[model samples]
Target: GMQIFVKTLTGKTITLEVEPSDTIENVKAKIQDKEGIPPDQQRLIFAGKQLEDGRTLSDYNIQKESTLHLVLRLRGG
Candidate 1:
């Protein structure tokens, strides 16, 4: 298992262990735990692609010890 640190918009950081089989949703849960952001409000970008709940790190060819940029996607007109 590998670990990565996630940086949030509010300057909060969380480190989570990454498993090859771990889905983006799993990462979102961890982020939510640290930042209290709802799952639907979380958006993660990596490898120039927006990650979806159905996608896993392995699906995106993400390597161990890679840092993921986590952002809160705002919605409202």
Candidate 2:
């Protein structure tokens, strides 16, 4: 279990505060909850890598203050 920050498509930055065992899917769901964007339509990118939902954050080597970039498939939030 661990904590991480998320930079939304919006100006607001949020915290995921996840566990070591948590998956990227869980992170996307958290984004959906706060921003009202469905996880399916979200492209979660970090550095130059696209995060897969089923994969763990550790799979991506996420750590505190690890950056995440979210791109919405549609024009709207």
Candidate 3:
């Protein structure tokens, strides 16, 4: 397991411990755990690519200390 950094447009950074095998869905769940934001509202992008829930961290070549961007998406009904 390793730590990855996620930065938001608001200049807030979140540090999460993750495994290479952890799915993007899993990472979002963790984000909800830490930031209280639901998975549906979380958008993670790395290496100029958007992350898919079906994919794992290793799929994106995310490694220790890697920094990813978090763009929140809110839908109000």
Error of 2 at 34 (Å): 7.3
Off by over 4 Å in 1: 26-37, 73-77
TM-score of model 2 relative to the true fold?
A: 0.67
Cα lDDT for residue 32, candidate 3: 72
In candidate 3, residue 3 scores what lDDT?
71
Poorest 10 consecutive residues by lDDT, candidate 2: 68-77
Off by over 4 Å in 3: 31-36, 74-77
| Candidate 3 clash pair list | none
Q: Over the stretch 1-77, how does candidate 3's per-residue lDDT look in tens digits?
A: 58778788899997767688878777667767877776665566777777777778788777688888878675786
What clash count goes with each model? 0, 2, 0
TM-score per prediction, in order, is 0.64, 0.67, 0.72
Report the lDDT tens digits of candidate 1 across residue range 7-33: 777888887676787787776677678
State how far residue 30 of model 2 sits from its true place (Å): 5.8
Highest lDDT scorer: 3
Cα lDDT tens digits, model 2, 1-77, are: 46667687777677757776677667666767888776665577878877765678677677777767767576755
Candidate 2 residue pairs that clash: 1-19, 1-20
User: Residue 36: error of model 2 in Å?
Assistant: 7.1
